[PDB]
Amino acid sequence: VPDAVVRESIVGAAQRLLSSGGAAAMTMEGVASEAGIAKKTLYRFASGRADLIGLLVESWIAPIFPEADPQDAAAALERIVYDIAQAVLSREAVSLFRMLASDADLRNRFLPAYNANGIERSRRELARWLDQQASAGRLPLPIPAERVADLLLSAVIAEPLRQITLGLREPLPAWDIAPRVADAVRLIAP
Amino acid sequence: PAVPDAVVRESIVGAAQRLLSSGGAAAMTMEGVASEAGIAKKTLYRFASGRADLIGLLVESWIAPIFPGFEADPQDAAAALERIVYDIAQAVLSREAVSLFRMLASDADLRNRFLPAYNANGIERSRRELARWLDQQASAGRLPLPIPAERVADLLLSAVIAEPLRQITLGLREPLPAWDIAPRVADAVRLIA
Numbered sequence: 001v002p003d004a005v006v007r008e009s010i011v012g013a014a015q016r017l018l019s020s021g022g023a024a025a026m027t028m029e030g031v032a033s034e035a036g037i038a039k040k041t042l043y044r045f046a047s048g049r050a051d052l053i054g055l056l057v058e059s060w061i062a063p064i065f066p067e068a069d070p071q072d073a074a075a076a077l078e079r080i081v082y083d084i085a086q087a088v089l090s091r092e093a094v095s096l097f098r099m100l101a102s103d104a105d106l107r108n109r110f111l112p113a114y115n116a117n118g119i120e121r122s123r124r125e126l127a128r129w130l131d132q133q134a135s136a137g138r139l140p141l142p143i144p145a146e147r148v149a150d151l152l153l154s155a156v157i158a159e160p161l162r163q164i165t166l167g168l169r170e171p172l173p174a175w176d177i178a179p180r181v182a183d184a185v186r187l188i189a190p
Numbered sequence: 191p192a193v194p195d196a197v198v199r200e201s202i203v204g205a206a207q208r209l210l211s212s213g214g215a216a217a218m219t220m221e222g223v224a225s226e227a228g229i230a231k232k233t234l235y236r237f238a239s240g241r242a243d244l245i246g247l248l249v250e251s252w253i254a255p256i257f258p259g260f261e262a263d264p265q266d267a268a269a270a271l272e273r274i275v276y277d278i279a280q281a282v283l284s285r286e287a288v289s290l291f292r293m294l295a296s297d298a299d300l301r302n303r304f305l306p307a308y309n310a311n312g313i314e315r316s317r318r319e320l321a322r323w324l325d326q327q328a329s330a331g332r333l334p335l336p337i338p339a340e341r342v343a344d345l346l347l348s349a350v351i352a353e354p355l356r357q358i359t360l361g362l363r364e365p366l367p368a369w370d371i372a373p374r375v376a377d378a379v380r381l382i383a
Contacts (some may be wrong), residue, residue, distance in 0.1 A: 101359050102296035111360055146376050150353070154344040158352030165295050166305060183341050188349075188381045189335070 004073050006179060009035040009046055011059045014052045015092060023099060023106055026052060054113035057096070060087040061118060065125045073138040074185055080129070083179045084122050091171040094164045101165065119157075123149050130189070138139075148189055155184040192255050195237075201227040202237055203251040207286060215293060215300055217370045218244060245290070246307035252281040254314060267332035274323065275375045278316045285365040288358045295359070313351075317343050324333045333383055342382065347369035350378045 013034030015024040031040045046052050064083050070076035088095065100107050100114060122189060127149040133139035141148050160177065163169040205226035209217040218241060238244045256277050265269035281287065294308060295302050321343040325338045327333035335342050354371065357363040 050303060054274060058199065097356075098295055101292055104361075107361055112363070115360070115362060142380055143377050148381070151349045151374075151378055154353035156347040158346075159344065159348035161356060162291075162352050166309075167301055168300075168305070180345075181339050185346055187342060187345055190215055 006035070007036060007045055007055065008059075010042065011055050015058050017095070018056075019092065023103075024050070025111075028052075043082065050110050050113040053096075053099065053110045054117040055187055057114055057124075058121070060090075060093060060119040061122050061166065065129075066130070068132055069136070070133075070138075072143070073133045077130075077133075077139070077189060078178075078181050079081050080183070080186050081152065081156055082127070082178060084119075084153065085181065086172050087159070088157060089160055089164060089172040094171050096162065098165055107112065120152065123153055123188065125170070126153065134139070140159075141189065152184055152188045155188055156181055196234060198227075198229060199237060199247065200251075201229060202234065202244070203248050204247050210290070210293075210340075211286065215241070215297075215304075219245075233296055242304050242307040245304045246311040248290075249308055249311040250315070252284070252286070252287060253278070253316050256316065257323075260323065260325070262323075262326060263330075264332070267327045268379055269287065271324075271333065271383065272372075272375050272379050273380075274320065275350055278320070279371045279375065280353060280366055281356070282313060283354055283358060283366040285352075286336060288355065288365050291355065292359055302372070309349060313347065316373075317347055320347065335382070346356065346378055346382065 009123050010031060013031045014026055016034060023182050024051060028039065028042060028048065032048075035042070046055060061084070064080070064087060067076055096114070098101055100111060101133070124145075127146040130139065130141065130145040130148055134141045134145060156177070160169065160172075160180070171177060196285065198379060202223060205223045206218055208228055209219075209222050218337075220234060220240065221231070223244060224231050227234070235366070238247055245303070258315045260274060261270060262318075290308070294304060319339075321340040324335065324342055325339035328339055350371070354363060354374070358365050
């Protein structure tokens with residue numbers, strides 16, 4: 001059984017447990033049971049619950065990035081940002097955020113993994129992509145790409161995260177974020 | 191006659207905050223606030239009818255002072271915009287403001303009770319005020335915009351503020367003014383102007 005398949009089983013298991021019983025349910029023993037593997041195997045992928053969180057968050061963003069040369073850079077940008085937003089504003093993503101906002105101990109245990117493997121990754125990836133388009137004169141930027149990435153992503157995603165966390169809106173994809181993505185691109189990175 | 195209403199209002203909001211900070215929502219009772227503010231029940235009830243109104247007054251006190259101070263015809267609209275956004279950020283990213291956000295994020299009952307007042311009196315009001323100001327600057331050609339002013343206000347406050355809110359909530363960053371948000375404000379405005 002390939003490692004990638006085992007990793008997928010682990011992430012699915014971790015999410016199922018988080019959703020059914022919160023952090024308390026997402027134990028190493030529980031995940032192994034759910035994933036169909038023994039601890040000796042699980043430990044190759046995760047040493048503890050923080051690592052499970054990192055795997056889970058990574059799974060949401062890893063598939064986003066794998067056109068470095070689109071003809072319509074702005075349209076490509078809209079698609080990338082939309083996909084990032086769908087990944088980090090889903091019910092599962094906002095529930096995890098809410099869990100950490102609500103428990104200092106859980107932040108203490110999981111925040112480094114959560115931060116390292118989430119939006120920060122997407123931000124770095126997007127910065128690289130933006131630099132390429134700027135270089136090709138395809139997408140000129142008035143400030144460094146890393147700043148554009150951060151501000152753009154923040155423009156689109158942050159207020160919605162705030163809203164969903166508070167129940168002012170339901171999680172994506174219940175409402176259409178495409179218009180917001182289009183407006184941000186027009187404003188921040190035309 | 192009596193001193194202006196602003197005097198007692200200030201006492202109420204101070205009291206509400208102290209109680210929130212000392213004992214949570216449960217400490218911020220109407221009787222508690224009246225006692226901490228040093229006012230009669232009948233006086234408090236002129237200003238707030240319940241805990242939700244107290245939260246609304248509190249949130250309003252953070253944002254109310256921002257716009258009276260704002261020139262309609264600035265010599266440098268981009269510079270003025272930076273100042274406005276910075277001021278909104280200081281008001282809504284303070285330790286007290288983030289604590290309140292965190293409280294609501296953490297308790298569904300508290301959201302059910304307080305969200306409407308919180309929402310109506312906070313960032314939503316600042317967004318509306320900022321949209322109005324941006325529309326004025328666009329109409330006057332000082333700050334042209336490619337999309338409607340309301341959209342720019344929303345996107346700009348999201349970019350500059352709602353993202354740090356996430357960070358502070360999580361403890362990734364300390365509340366303002368522990369770190370300097372001016373560079374972020376400047377970068378965001380440069381993308382506009």
